[PDB]
Design a protein around this ligand. Structure first.
Ligand SMILES: [Mg+2]
Ligand SMILES: [Zn+2]
Length: 66
């Protein structure tokens, strides 16, 4: 698995973190996604990174590959 780190913008509450996690986990091949709420970052283990940023954008939040 490859590790992809994302900066996240637009999170207001811990339920924004679980929403972003759900959105990313819906992408086939994601083997783990954990959003660090305080760091406003996602750590994704994936089996291009732009499919992951699009999952976040489609869920209503901004992501950027780090
Ligand atoms: Mg930014
Ligand atoms: Zn929220």
């Amino acid at each position: 698995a490859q590790t992809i780190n994302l900066q996240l913008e637009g999170m207001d509450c811990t339920s924004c973190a679980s929403s972003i996690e759900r959105a990313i986990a819906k992408v086939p091949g994601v083997q783990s996604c954990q959003v660090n709420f305080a760091l406003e970052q996602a750590v994704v283990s994936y089996h291009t990174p732009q499919i992951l940023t699009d999952a976040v954008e489609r869920a209503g939040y901004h992501a950027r590959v780090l």
